[PDB]
Amino acid sequence: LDLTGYLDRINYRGATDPTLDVLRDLVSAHTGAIAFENLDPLMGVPVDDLSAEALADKLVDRRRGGYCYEHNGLIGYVLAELGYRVRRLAGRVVWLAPPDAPTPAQTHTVLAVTFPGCQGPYLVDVGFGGMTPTAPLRLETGTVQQTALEPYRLDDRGDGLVLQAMVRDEWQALYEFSTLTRPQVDLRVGSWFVSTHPTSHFVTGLMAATVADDARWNLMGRNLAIHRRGGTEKILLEDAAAVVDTLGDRFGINVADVGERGRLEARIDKVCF
Ligand SMILES: *CCC(=O)c1ccccc1
C-alpha cells in the first residue's frame, strides 16, 4: 500500500491512470532504478516471503534489488493498485540452451496485464536478470517487438509460448511459459527452490543486472559486461572488495543491508575467486 514510496524509489513523476503509456513509463522507470541481484540466496538467506509488504520493505525501503519473484511480485502489486488486471504466470528458463536440453524447472515468473481500453493482453517482465524486456510486450505470436534495447518476439511452443530476443547476431530463446494463472503458493515453492537448492545458480554464484543509458550492465561473479548498441566491453574485476564497490556504486544496491561487509566479501571471494 506504500504506492508513493515505490514511485519515489523508481523516480516516477508521470500520470497514474491505467493506460499503455503509463505501463511503458513505469516499466522503463522500474528497470532503470531497481537492480537485479541475488545477494540474499548467495548469503544463505532464502526468498520465501512474496507478500506486498515484504517485497516493498526490501526493494523500496531498504534500497535493495532482487530476482524475478521479487521484481515481478512488487510491480504486480503496484499495477493491481493502479487499476491494471494482473495475472501471475510461471516459466522455464531456456537461455543459451539448445532445443534438446533437459526440461528446466519452473523457476521464473512473469505477468499478463490488461487495462481499460487495451486491444489485448501485455507481457510484463522486469525480473529476468541480464535480458529483461524494458518495455511491456504485446502478448501475441509472430510479431517482432523492438524495445529501447534488443528486439523481442513471442512464438507458440506446444501448450504454451516462448519469449525470444535478438542477442548479438541471432534469435535466442529466453524462456517458455504457460498463459494459465498460477496461485501464489506455487510461486513460493519455485522461489524456495531457486533460493535454497545447492545446485541453483543463485546459490552457487553472483549475478547482478541493471539498465542505464541505452546500455545493459551485467555482472556474473567478477565478470562485468557493458552491452551497448555499438558493442560490448568486458571488465575483469580485481578482487572481492572491488566487486562489492561495483554492487554499491554502479548497481545502486544498499550493500550495508546484507550485514558486515567482511562476510559478503569473504562469500564473494570463496565463490567467485
Ligand atoms: C527468478 C529467476 C530469475 O530471476 C532469472 C532466471 C534465469 C535467468 C535470469 C534471471
Numbering used by the authors: 3 to 275
Report text from the authors:
To validate the observations obtained using MS, the 3D-structure of MMNAT was determined in complex with compound 1, the parent piperidinol identified from the HTS. The crystallographic structure determination was performed by incubating MMNAT with 1 in solution (15∶1 inhibitor to protein ratio in the native form) and then to crystallise it (co-crystallisation). According to the proposed mechanism of inhibition, this method is expected to allow time for the ligand to mature into the covalent modification of the active site cysteine with the 3-phenyl-3-oxopropyl moiety (POP). The crystals diffracted to 2.7 Å and data were processed as described in Methods and in Table S2. Upon refinement of the co-crystallised complex MMNAT-POP, a continuous excess electron density connected to the active site Cys70 was observed, consistent with the proposed 3-phenyl-3-oxopropyl modification. The binding site of the fragment which was observed attached to the active site cysteine was accommodated by the fragment predicted from the MS studies using a 1∶1 ratio of compound 1 to MMNAT. These data are entirely compatible with the MS data obtained using the same compound to MMNAT ratio, since the protein remains in the native state throughout the crystallisation and excess inhibitor was removed by buffer exchange prior to crystallisation as described in Methods. Therefore, we propose that in the presence of an equimolar amount of the inhibitor, the active site cysteine Cys70 is the residue which is modified. The mechanism of inactivation of NAT involves the formation of PVKs that form an adduct with the active site cysteine. Extensive dialysis of the enzyme after incubation with compound 1 was completely ineffective in restoring the activity of the enzyme, supporting the proposal of tight irreversible binding of 1 to the NAT enzyme.
NAT is a cytosolic enzyme that is found in M. tuberculosis and many other organisms. This enzyme catalyses the transfer of an acyl group, usually an acetyl, to an arylamine substrate using a conserved cysteine residue by a Ping-Pong bi-bi mechanism. NAT utilises Pr-CoA in addition to acetyl-CoA (Ac-CoA) as an acyl donor, both of which are products of degradation of the alkyl moiety of cholesterol. Arylamine N-acetyltransferase is one of the novel targets that plays an important role in cell wall synthesis and intracellular survival of mycobacteria within the macrophage.
